[PDB]
Structure formats: C-alpha cells, structure tokens
Coordinates of all heavy atoms in Angstrom, one line a residue:
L173 N -16.8 6.0 -6.4 CA -17.8 5.0 -6.0 C -17.4 4.2 -4.8 O -16.6 3.3 -4.9 CB -18.0 4.0 -7.2 CG -19.0 4.3 -8.3 CD1 -19.0 3.1 -9.3 CD2 -20.4 4.5 -7.7
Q174 N -18.1 4.5 -3.7 CA -17.8 3.8 -2.4 C -18.8 2.7 -2.3 O -19.9 2.7 -2.8 CB -17.9 4.7 -1.2 CG -17.2 6.1 -1.3 CD -15.7 6.0 -1.1 OE1 -15.2 5.3 -0.2 NE2 -15.0 6.7 -1.9
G175 N -18.4 1.6 -1.6 CA -19.3 0.5 -1.4 C -19.7 -0.2 -2.7 O -20.9 -0.5 -2.9
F176 N -18.8 -0.2 -3.6 CA -19.1 -0.8 -4.9 C -18.0 -1.9 -5.2 O -16.8 -1.7 -4.9 CB -19.1 0.2 -6.0 CG -19.3 -0.3 -7.4 CD1 -20.6 -0.6 -7.9 CD2 -18.2 -0.6 -8.3 CE1 -20.8 -1.1 -9.1 CE2 -18.4 -1.1 -9.5 CZ -19.7 -1.4 -10.0
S177 N -18.4 -2.9 -5.9 CA -17.4 -3.9 -6.4 C -17.8 -4.3 -7.8 O -19.0 -4.4 -8.2 CB -17.5 -5.1 -5.4 OG -16.4 -6.0 -5.7
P178 N -16.9 -4.7 -8.7 CA -17.2 -4.9 -10.1 C -18.3 -5.9 -10.4 O -19.0 -5.7 -11.4 CB -15.9 -5.3 -10.7 CG -14.9 -4.5 -9.9 CD -15.4 -4.7 -8.5
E179 N -18.4 -6.9 -9.6 CA -19.4 -8.0 -9.8 C -20.9 -7.5 -9.5 O -21.8 -8.3 -9.8 CB -19.1 -9.3 -9.1 CG -19.5 -9.5 -7.7 CD -18.8 -8.5 -6.7 OE1 -17.6 -8.1 -7.0 OE2 -19.3 -8.2 -5.7
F180 N -21.0 -6.3 -9.0 CA -22.3 -5.7 -8.8 C -23.1 -5.5 -10.1 O -24.3 -5.5 -10.2 CB -22.2 -4.3 -8.1 CG -22.0 -4.3 -6.6 CD1 -21.3 -5.4 -6.0 CD2 -22.3 -3.3 -5.8 CE1 -21.1 -5.4 -4.7 CE2 -22.1 -3.3 -4.5 CZ -21.5 -4.4 -3.9
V181 N -22.3 -5.4 -11.2 CA -22.8 -5.2 -12.5 C -22.3 -6.4 -13.5 O -21.3 -7.0 -13.2 CB -22.3 -3.8 -13.1 CG1 -22.9 -2.7 -12.2 CG2 -20.8 -3.7 -13.2
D182 N -23.1 -6.6 -14.5 CA -22.7 -7.7 -15.5 C -21.4 -7.3 -16.1 O -20.4 -8.1 -16.2 CB -23.7 -8.0 -16.6 CG -25.0 -8.7 -16.0 OD1 -25.2 -8.7 -14.8 OD2 -25.7 -9.3 -16.9
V183 N -21.3 -6.0 -16.6 CA -20.1 -5.5 -17.3 C -19.8 -4.2 -16.8 O -20.7 -3.3 -16.7 CB -20.4 -5.4 -18.8 CG1 -19.2 -4.7 -19.5 CG2 -20.6 -6.8 -19.5
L184 N -18.5 -4.0 -16.3 CA -17.9 -2.8 -15.9 C -16.9 -2.4 -17.0 O -16.0 -3.1 -17.3 CB -17.3 -2.9 -14.6 CG -16.5 -1.6 -14.0 CD1 -17.5 -0.4 -13.9 CD2 -15.9 -1.9 -12.7
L185 N -17.1 -1.2 -17.6 CA -16.1 -0.7 -18.5 C -15.4 0.5 -17.9 O -16.1 1.5 -17.5 CB -16.8 -0.2 -19.8 CG -17.7 -1.2 -20.5 CD1 -18.5 -0.4 -21.6 CD2 -16.8 -2.3 -21.1
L186 N -14.1 0.5 -17.8 CA -13.3 1.6 -17.2 C -12.3 2.1 -18.2 O -11.3 1.5 -18.6 CB -12.5 1.1 -16.0 CG -13.2 0.6 -14.7 CD1 -12.2 0.4 -13.6 CD2 -14.3 1.6 -14.3
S187 N -12.6 3.3 -18.7 CA -11.9 4.0 -19.8 C -10.7 4.8 -19.2 O -10.8 5.3 -18.0 CB -12.8 4.9 -20.6 OG -13.7 4.2 -21.4
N188 N -9.7 5.0 -19.9 CA -8.6 5.8 -19.5 C -8.1 6.6 -20.8 O -6.9 6.6 -21.1 CB -7.5 5.0 -18.9 CG -6.4 5.9 -18.2 OD1 -6.8 6.9 -17.6 ND2 -5.2 5.4 -18.2
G189 N -9.0 7.3 -21.4 CA -8.6 8.1 -22.6 C -8.1 7.3 -23.8 O -8.8 6.3 -24.1
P190 N -7.0 7.7 -24.3 CA -6.3 6.9 -25.4 C -5.5 5.7 -24.8 O -4.9 5.0 -25.6 CB -5.5 7.9 -26.1 CG -5.1 8.9 -25.1 CD -6.2 8.9 -24.1
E191 N -5.4 5.6 -23.5 CA -4.6 4.6 -22.8 C -5.4 3.3 -22.5 O -6.6 3.3 -22.6 CB -4.1 5.2 -21.5 CG -3.2 6.5 -21.7 CD -1.9 6.2 -22.3 OE1 -1.7 6.1 -23.5 OE2 -0.9 6.0 -21.5
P192 N -4.6 2.2 -22.2 CA -5.3 1.0 -22.0 C -6.4 1.1 -20.9 O -6.2 1.8 -19.9 CB -4.2 0.1 -21.5 CG -3.0 0.6 -22.3 CD -3.2 2.0 -22.3
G193 N -7.6 0.5 -21.2 CA -8.6 0.4 -20.2 C -8.8 -0.9 -19.5 O -8.1 -1.9 -19.9
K194 N -9.8 -1.0 -18.6 CA -10.1 -2.3 -18.0 C -11.6 -2.6 -18.3 O -12.4 -1.7 -18.4 CB -9.9 -2.3 -16.5 CG -8.5 -1.8 -16.0 CD -7.5 -2.9 -16.1 CE -6.4 -2.7 -15.1 NZ -6.1 -1.3 -14.9
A195 N -12.0 -3.9 -18.4 CA -13.3 -4.3 -18.6 C -13.5 -5.5 -17.7 O -12.7 -6.4 -17.6 CB -13.7 -4.6 -20.0
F196 N -14.7 -5.6 -17.0 CA -15.0 -6.7 -16.2 C -16.3 -7.4 -16.6 O -17.3 -6.7 -16.9 CB -15.2 -6.3 -14.7 CG -13.9 -5.7 -14.1 CD1 -13.5 -4.4 -14.4 CD2 -13.2 -6.4 -13.2 CE1 -12.4 -3.8 -13.8 CE2 -12.1 -5.9 -12.6 CZ -11.7 -4.6 -12.9
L197 N -16.2 -8.7 -16.7 CA -17.4 -9.5 -17.0 C -17.7 -10.3 -15.7 O -16.8 -11.2 -15.3 CB -17.2 -10.4 -18.2 CG -18.3 -11.4 -18.6 CD1 -19.7 -10.6 -18.9 CD2 -18.0 -12.2 -19.8
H198 N -18.8 -10.1 -15.1 CA -19.1 -10.7 -13.8 C -17.9 -10.7 -12.8 O -17.6 -11.7 -12.2 CB -19.7 -12.1 -14.0 CG -21.0 -12.1 -14.8 ND1 -22.2 -11.6 -14.3 CD2 -21.2 -12.4 -16.1 CE1 -23.1 -11.7 -15.2 NE2 -22.5 -12.2 -16.3
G199 N -17.2 -9.6 -12.8 CA -16.1 -9.4 -11.9 C -14.8 -9.8 -12.4 O -13.7 -9.6 -11.7
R200 N -14.7 -10.5 -13.5 CA -13.5 -11.0 -14.0 C -12.9 -10.0 -15.0 O -13.5 -9.6 -16.0 CB -13.7 -12.4 -14.7 CG -14.1 -13.4 -13.7 CD -14.2 -14.8 -14.3 NE -14.8 -14.7 -15.6 CZ -16.1 -14.7 -15.9 NH1 -17.0 -14.6 -14.9 NH2 -16.5 -14.6 -17.1
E201 N -11.6 -9.7 -14.7 CA -10.9 -8.6 -15.4 C -10.4 -8.9 -16.8 O -9.8 -10.0 -17.0 CB -9.8 -8.1 -14.5 CG -9.3 -6.7 -14.8 CD -8.2 -6.2 -13.8 OE1 -8.0 -6.9 -12.8 OE2 -7.6 -5.2 -14.1
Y202 N -10.5 -7.9 -17.7 CA -9.9 -7.9 -19.0 C -9.2 -6.6 -19.1 O -9.6 -5.6 -18.5 CB -10.9 -8.1 -20.1 CG -11.6 -9.4 -20.2 CD1 -12.5 -9.8 -19.2 CD2 -11.4 -10.3 -21.2 CE1 -13.2 -11.0 -19.3 CE2 -12.0 -11.5 -21.4 CZ -13.0 -11.8 -20.4 OH -13.7 -13.0 -20.4
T203 N -8.1 -6.6 -19.9 CA -7.5 -5.3 -20.3 C -7.9 -5.1 -21.8 O -8.1 -6.1 -22.5 CB -6.0 -5.2 -20.1 OG1 -5.3 -6.4 -20.8 CG2 -5.6 -5.3 -18.7
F204 N -8.0 -3.9 -22.2 CA -8.2 -3.6 -23.7 C -7.4 -2.3 -24.0 O -7.2 -1.5 -23.2 CB -9.6 -3.6 -24.0 CG -10.4 -2.3 -23.5 CD1 -10.5 -1.2 -24.3 CD2 -10.9 -2.3 -22.2 CE1 -11.2 -0.1 -23.9 CE2 -11.5 -1.2 -21.7 CZ -11.7 0.0 -22.6
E205 N -7.1 -2.2 -25.3 CA -6.4 -1.1 -25.8 C -7.2 -0.3 -26.9 O -7.6 -0.9 -27.9 CB -5.1 -1.6 -26.5 CG -4.1 -0.5 -27.0 CD -3.0 -1.2 -27.8 OE1 -3.2 -1.7 -28.9 OE2 -1.9 -1.2 -27.2
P206 N -7.6 0.9 -26.6 CA -8.3 1.7 -27.6 C -7.4 1.8 -28.9 O -6.2 1.7 -28.9 CB -8.4 3.1 -27.0 CG -8.3 2.9 -25.6 CD -7.3 1.7 -25.4
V207 N -8.1 1.9 -30.0 CA -7.4 2.1 -31.3 C -6.6 3.4 -31.2 O -7.1 4.4 -30.7 CB -8.5 2.2 -32.4 CG1 -7.8 2.5 -33.8 CG2 -9.3 0.9 -32.5
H208 N -5.4 3.3 -31.7 CA -4.5 4.5 -31.7 C -4.7 5.5 -32.7 O -3.9 5.7 -33.6 CB -3.0 4.0 -31.8 CG -2.5 3.1 -30.7 ND1 -2.5 3.5 -29.4 CD2 -2.0 1.8 -30.7 CE1 -2.0 2.5 -28.6 NE2 -1.7 1.5 -29.4
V209 N -5.9 6.2 -32.6 CA -6.2 7.3 -33.6 C -5.2 8.5 -33.4 O -4.7 8.7 -32.4 CB -7.7 7.8 -33.4 CG1 -8.6 6.7 -33.7 CG2 -8.0 8.5 -32.1
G210 N -5.0 9.2 -34.5 CA -4.1 10.3 -34.6 C -4.7 11.6 -33.9 O -4.0 12.4 -33.3
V211 N -6.0 11.8 -34.0 CA -6.7 13.1 -33.6 C -6.7 13.2 -32.0 O -6.9 12.3 -31.3 CB -8.1 13.2 -34.2 CG1 -9.0 12.1 -33.7 CG2 -8.7 14.6 -33.9
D212 N -6.3 14.4 -31.6 CA -6.2 14.7 -30.1 C -7.6 14.9 -29.5 O -7.9 14.3 -28.4 CB -5.3 15.9 -29.9 CG -4.7 15.9 -28.5 OD1 -4.6 14.8 -27.9 OD2 -4.3 17.0 -28.0
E213 N -8.5 15.7 -30.1 CA -9.9 15.9 -29.7 C -10.6 14.6 -29.4 O -10.7 13.8 -30.3 CB -10.6 16.8 -30.7 CG -12.1 17.0 -30.4 CD -12.3 17.9 -29.1 OE1 -11.9 19.1 -29.1 OE2 -12.7 17.3 -28.1
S214 N -11.2 14.5 -28.2 CA -11.9 13.3 -27.8 C -13.3 13.5 -27.2 O -13.8 12.6 -26.6 CB -11.0 12.4 -26.9 OG -10.9 13.0 -25.6
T215 N -13.9 14.7 -27.4 CA -15.2 14.9 -27.0 C -16.2 13.8 -27.3 O -16.3 13.4 -28.5 CB -15.8 16.2 -27.6 OG1 -15.1 17.4 -27.0 CG2 -17.3 16.4 -27.2
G216 N -16.8 13.3 -26.3 CA -17.9 12.3 -26.4 C -17.4 10.8 -26.5 O -18.2 9.9 -26.6
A217 N -16.1 10.6 -26.5 CA -15.5 9.3 -26.7 C -16.1 8.2 -25.7 O -16.5 7.2 -26.2 CB -14.0 9.3 -26.6
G218 N -16.2 8.5 -24.4 CA -16.6 7.6 -23.4 C -18.1 7.3 -23.5 O -18.6 6.2 -23.3
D219 N -18.9 8.3 -24.0 CA -20.3 8.1 -24.1 C -20.6 7.3 -25.4 O -21.5 6.5 -25.3 CB -21.0 9.5 -24.2 CG -20.5 10.4 -23.1 OD1 -20.9 10.1 -21.9 OD2 -19.8 11.5 -23.4

C-alpha cells in the first residue's frame, strides 16, 4: 500500500499469523496477541 497512512481509516488491523499483531484507532497504535491455539492449519483466520 503506497500513499497510505493508518489514520486514513478509523481502524487498521494488521495480522501476523499466530504472532503479535498491530491495530490502529484513528492512527493510534495498539499491539495485540492472538490466542495461542494448538492447531497449525489457519485457513480463513484473517477473514
């Protein structure tokens, strides 16, 4: 995404699989941790 900044949107959610992600509310950053599920298969998780 070129020419984009997080405050363009009310909420930006940035996933990183089972690893910690980032979330922005009006450009202000939060970190969050997905639940540590055991199962490896992750089809559809981000959707």
Side-chain angles (χ1 to χ4, degrees):
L173 272 184
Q174 313 282 318
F176 178 83
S177 191
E179 85 293 335
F180 284 26
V181 300
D182 287 18
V183 171
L184 177 60
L185 305 169
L186 295 188
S187 290
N188 192 37
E191 302 286 85
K194 308 282 209 322
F196 297 78
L197 180 55
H198 301 285
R200 298 184 317 282
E201 195 176 354
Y202 293 70
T203 56
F204 70 97
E205 182 187 73
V207 180
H208 295 302
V209 299
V211 60
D212 204 22
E213 178 65 67
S214 69
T215 292
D219 310 296

